[PDB]
């Protein structure tokens, strides 16, 4: 019976959506989005994907079910993108990929797999990290502990505090790492920090779990993977949850992949059969559309050439706004040092605004942002940069 059922809380970011689409003062800027927007403030469907879709519309002959792990071409394409084209992990066949409904679905299936087939109990999530991370692991029954990460003072990665908090984790604990473009800080470890982390991860016996939802948004496709590749060359086992939502603009088609890595082909096949069991009990088989689109794009090099360009254009727009944000702030005039913004990668960063400030921002100006002071840089156009910086400067 449902009458004494507790109403679910307001999702941190969803409340904003509604308040924004209510604010009758149209000079309003929504910075708590999470999705990429072009200079027009529009989230378009990539040309490569549209071409890909016409191709599928012309060539599909059936809608019959995919296998639990999805379209195979999609699988090999994802692990090549992740580990590199000549990666030993691929050659020795010690990796297996299951196509899943978005990066979140990949995280849930990993969670269920881990919860039913191993003795992992705790999962270490960075502080801060994407909020849905806790809920995902919690629903699988795993407990979430947090390691330090953000130096609120210097707006940086507090490595010392970081390694110092991980020492609290036992061998057997799963440690969640953001591949690149840390959500919500945009601070990523340098390659040397990744390596010390890889080294320490082996000595302490953690099971690395990479959340890779922004490949291509920090430096490039290969560059962004260098961190995970540092771990994958040092570990016998690891799990990587990747999303194609942002980098292919396929948000609503739900396309991601959960990749398993084990010591050998024999062991990976045995563990993968159970991961497939977890999928069958969840949604049975994955949604073919978004994945078909990614599979055909990445495999037709004419189409892959166009996509790559569309992604570097996306990446560069974001980098121009982080850059243009810093100095438009220095023109509107305020005691500051927002240059830390330029050092950060991806669509996000903590502006360093107090919840009090972010509040008067929404209230007195119509500039919307998430309470944590997290701001989506892709929500800034060269046009709305001025009023944005004026408002920000007027609340400091």
Ligand X SMILES: Cc1ncc(COP(=O)(O)O)c(CN)c1O
Q: What string marks each residue from 210 to 239 as x (binds a copy of itself by CB under 8 A) or -?
A: ---------------------------x--
Whether the upstream peptide bond of residue 44 has omega within 30° of 0, thus cis, is no
Residue 183 site contact among a copy of itself, ligand X, none (CB < 5 to 8 Å, cut-off depends on kind): ligand X
Is 34 labeled as ligand-binding? yes
Instruction: Tell me which residues are annotated as active site.
Output: 130, 211, 246
* Residues of this chain, 271-330, that bind ligand X according to CB under 6 A: 284
What mask, x for binding a copy of itself by CB under 8 A, covers residues 49 to 78? xx--xx--x--xxxxxxx------------
The interface mask with a copy of itself, positions 189-208, x = CB under 8 A, is ------------------x-
Q: Could you give the C-alpha distances from 347 to 29, 184, 295, 340, in angstroms and in order?
A: 16, 9, 25, 14
Q: Are strands 150-151 and 156-157 parallel, antiparallel or unpaired?
A: antiparallel
Residue 96 as a binder of a copy of itself (CB under 8 A): the answer is: no
Q: Which residue, 64 or 119, has its beta carbon nearer to ligand X?
A: 64
Among 79, 245, 344, 376, binds ligand X (CB under 6 A): 245
- CB of residue 29 vs a copy of itself: minimum separation in angstroms? 17
Q: How far is the CB of 266 from ligand X (least distance, A)?
A: 31
Give the one entry of a copy of itself, ligand X, none that residue 213 binds, where binding means its C-beta sits below a cut-off of 5 to 8 angstroms depending on kind.
ligand X
243 contributes a contact to ligand X by CB under 6 A: yes
> Using CB under 6 A, which residues numbered 117 to 136 contact ligand X?
130
Q: Does 213 bind ligand X (CB under 6 A)?
A: yes
Tell me if 259 contacts ligand X by CB under 6 A: no
Q: How far is the CB of 108 from ligand X (least distance, A)?
A: 10
Could you say whether residue 253 binds ligand X (CB under 6 A)? Answer: no
As a whole number of angstroms, the distance between CA 230 and CA 221 comes to: 15
Kindly identify the residues of this chain, within the stretch 106-165, that bind a copy of itself according to CB under 8 A.
108, 112, 116-118, 132, 135-136, 138-139
Provide, rounded to whole angstroms, the least separation between the CB of residue 176 and ligand X: 10
Partner touching 225 among a copy of itself, ligand X, none, CB below 5 to 8 Å by kind: none
Binding site for ligand X (CB under 6 A): 34, 102-104, 130, 178, 183, 211, 213, 243, 245, 256, 284
Binding residue positions: 34, 130, 183, 374
């Amino acid at each position: 019976m449902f009458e004494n059922i507790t109403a679910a809380p307001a999702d941190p970011i969803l409340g904003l959506a509604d308040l924004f689409r209510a604010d009758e003062r149209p000079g309003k800027i929504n910075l708590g989005i999470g999705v990429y927007k072009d200079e027009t403030g529009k989230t378009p469907v990539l040309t490569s994907v549209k071409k890909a879709e016409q191709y599928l519309l012309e060539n599909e002959t059936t809608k019959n079910y995919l296998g639990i792990d999805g379209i195979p071409e999609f699988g090999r394409c994802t692990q090549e993108l992740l580990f590199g084209k000549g990666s030993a992990l691929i050659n020795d066949k010690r990796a297996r990929t299951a196509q899943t409904p978005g990066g979140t679905g990949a995280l849930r299936v990993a969670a269920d797999f881990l919860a039913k087939n191993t003795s992992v109990k705790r999962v270490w999530v960075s502080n801060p990290s994407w909020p849905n991370h806790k809920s995902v692991f919690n629903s699988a029954g795993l407990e979430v502990r947090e390691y330090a990460y953000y130096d609120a003072e210097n707006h940086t990665l507090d490595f010392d505090a970081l390694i110092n908090s991980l020492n609290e984790a036992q061998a057997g604990d799963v440690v969640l790492f953001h591949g690149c473009c840390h959500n919500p800080t945009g601070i990523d470890p340098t390659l040397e920090q990744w390596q010390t982390l890889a080294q320490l991860s082996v000595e302490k016996g953690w099971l690395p779990l990479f959340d890779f939802a922004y490949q291509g948004f920090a430096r490039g496709l290969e560059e962004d993977a260098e961190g995970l590749r540092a771990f994958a060359a040092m570990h016998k086992e690891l799990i990587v949850a990747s999303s194609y939502s942002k980098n292919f603009g396929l948000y609503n088609e739900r396309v991601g992949a959960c990749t398993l890595v084990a010591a050998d082909s024999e062991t990976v096949d045995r563990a993968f059969s159970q991961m497939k069991a977890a999928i069958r009990a969840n949604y049975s088989n994955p949604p073919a559309h978004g994945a078909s689109v990614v599979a055909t794009i990445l495999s037709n090099d004419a189409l892959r050439a166009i996509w790559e360009q569309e992604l570097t254009d996306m990446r560069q727009r974001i980098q121009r706004m982080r850059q243009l944000f810093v100095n438009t702030l220095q023109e509107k005039g305020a005691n500051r040092d927002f240059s830390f913004i330029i050092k950060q990668n991806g669509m996000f960063s903590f502006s360093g605004l107090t919840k009090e400030q972010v509040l008067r921002l929404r209230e007195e100006f119509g500039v919307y942002a998430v309470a944590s002071g997290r701001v989506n840089v892709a929500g800034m156009t060269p046009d709305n940069m001025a009023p944005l910086c004026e408002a920000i400067v007027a609340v400091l």
